[PDB]
C-alpha cells in the first residue's frame, strides 16, 4: 500500500470562541490613507449628488468598436515626432544648394491637439470631426465644447482616456483632438465614422441637455428601501389578489 495510517485530518473549527480565525482577506475593512480614501469617496459623491447635464454628458462616451476605428484612423494623422522634425529640415538644407531647391514642397494633413487650437477651428468650421476626452481634470476646460460643436454643426465624440487620446500625439494627456482634413485614400473612412458619431451625439443634443444623472443611492440603502417595499407589497398584494 501507499497510504500511511499515521496521516490524519486534523480539521479546524473556525467557529466563535473555537479555533482562532483564518487570515482572510480584509480589503473592504482596511483603514486607507487619506489620499486613497478621498479619491474613492469623491467618485461616490458624483454618483450620490444630482449631477447637472453639461458634466453628465461626459459619462456618455464612445463604444469600444467605434473607438478602435477612430484610433486606427488617427494613426495615419499623428503629428511628426522629434527626429522626424530634424530630418525634414536637414533634407531641405541639403537640397537647396545641390539639385534644385523649390522651398515649400507640399505639406501633408495632421491632427489638431489642444482645446484652444480646436475651439478656434470649431469657431471657424475648419474641423470635420472633434474628439474630446471624458476625464479632463478641471471640467471647465471642456464643457462648452460639445455645445459649441453642435452649434457649429461639427460631429464630435467623447473618447475614454485623455491619456490614450494624448498618446496619438506624443504627450502625456490631451484634452481634445480634431481633423481638419484627411487624405483622399482615407477620406471615406472618416465620413463613415463621422455619420455614425453624429447620430449618437450631435443629432440628439436636446436629450443630452435634459439628461441629469447622479442621484443614485448606496446599494446598502437601496436594498433597505426595496426590502421595505417588499414588506409594503406583501402587506397589500397577496391579501387581496
Amino acid at each position: 500500500k501507499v497510504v500511511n495510517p499515521l496521516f490524519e485530518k486534523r480539521p479546524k473549527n473556525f467557529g466563535i470562541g473555537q479555533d482562532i480565525q483564518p487570515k482572510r482577506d480584509l480589503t473592504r475593512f482596511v483603514k486607507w490613507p487619506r489620499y486613497i480614501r478621498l479619491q474613492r469617496q469623491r467618485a461616490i459623491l458624483y454618483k450620490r449628488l444630482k449631477v447637472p447635464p453639461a458634466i453628465n454628458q461626459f459619462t456618455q462616451v464612445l463604444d469600444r468598436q467605434t473607438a478602435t476605428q477612430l484610433l486606427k484612423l488617427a494613426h495615419k494623422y499623428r503629428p511628426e515626432t522629434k527626429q522626424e522634425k530634424k530630418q525634414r529640415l536637414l533634407a531641405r538644407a541639403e537640397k537647396k544648394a545641390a539639385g534644385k531647391g523649390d522651398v515649400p514642397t507640399k505639406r501633408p494633413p495632421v491632427l489638431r491637439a489642444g482645446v484652444n487650437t480646436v475651439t478656434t477651428l470649431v469657431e471657424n468650421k475648419k474641423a470635420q470631426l472633434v474628439v474630446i476626452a471624458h476625464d479632463v481634470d478641471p471640467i471647465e476646460l471642456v464643457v462648452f465644447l460639445p455645445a459649441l460643436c453642435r452649434k457649429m454643426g461639427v460631429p464630435y465624440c467623447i473618447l475614454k482616456g485623455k491619456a490614450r487620446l494624448g498618446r496619438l500625439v506624443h504627450r502625456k494627456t490631451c484634452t481634445t483632438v480634431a481633423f481638419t482634413q484627411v487624405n483622399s485614400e482615407d477620406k471615406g473612412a472618416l465620413a463613415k465614422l463621422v455619420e455614425a458619431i453624429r447620430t449618437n451625439y450631435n443629432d440628439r443634443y436636446d436629450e443630452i441637455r435634459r439628461h441629469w444623472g447622479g442621484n443614485v443611492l448606496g446599494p446598502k440603502s437601496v436594498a433597505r428601501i426595496a426590502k421595505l417595499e417588499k414588506a409594503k407589497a406583501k402587506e397589500l398584494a397577496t391579501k387581496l389578489g
Binding site: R24, L26, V30, K31, I36
Partner: protein, 119 residues
C-alpha cells in the same frame, strides 16, 4: 490578486540609494590637529611628580584636555619609543589634564626620565 491580510495599510518599503555626490563639498580632509606631539604638552618635574617616577615606575605629564587615555598611551608609545602599562588621567583645577602613565616593568621610568631631560 494579492489580498490584504491585515486591516492596516503601512507605508511601502521603497528603494533608497546611497549618496553619489557630483562633487566633494570640502576640498580635502581636515588635517588632524591632535597629533603625537600636540597631545603631550610637557612633563611635570614637581617633587610629587619625581617621587611618582622614582618609586612607582611612572612618568607624569601634562596632556591636551581633549585626549583619551587611548590616545595618550599611543602618543607616549610613539614619541618615546616606549611601552605603557596604563594611563591614569585627571584634570587640574587650572585646566590642564594631567596624566600619570605607568610604564611596563621591562622599562625603568628613571632611565626614560633621564632620556627626555627631566630629573
Amino acid at each position: 490578486k494579492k489580498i490584504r491580510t491585515s486591516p492596516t495599510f503601512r507605508r511601502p518599503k521603497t528603494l533608497r540609494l546611497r549618496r553619489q555626490p557630483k562633487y566633494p563639498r570640502k576640498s580635502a580632509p581636515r588635517r588632524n590637529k591632535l597629533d603625537h606631539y600636540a597631545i603631550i604638552k610637557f612633563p611635570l618635574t614637581t617633587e610629587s611628580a619625581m617621587k611618582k617616577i622614582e618609586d612607582n615606575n611612572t612618568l607624569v605629564f601634562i596632556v591636551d584636555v581633549k585626549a583619551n587615555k587611548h590616545q595618550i598611551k599611543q602618543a607616549v608609545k610613539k614619541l618615546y619609543d616606549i611601552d605603557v602599562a596604563k594611563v591614569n588621567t585627571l584634570i587640574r583645577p587650572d585646566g590642564e589634564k594631567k596624566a600619570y602613565v605607568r610604564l611596563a616593568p621591562d622599562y625603568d621610568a628613571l632611565d626614560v626620565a633621564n632620556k627626555i631631560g627631566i630629573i
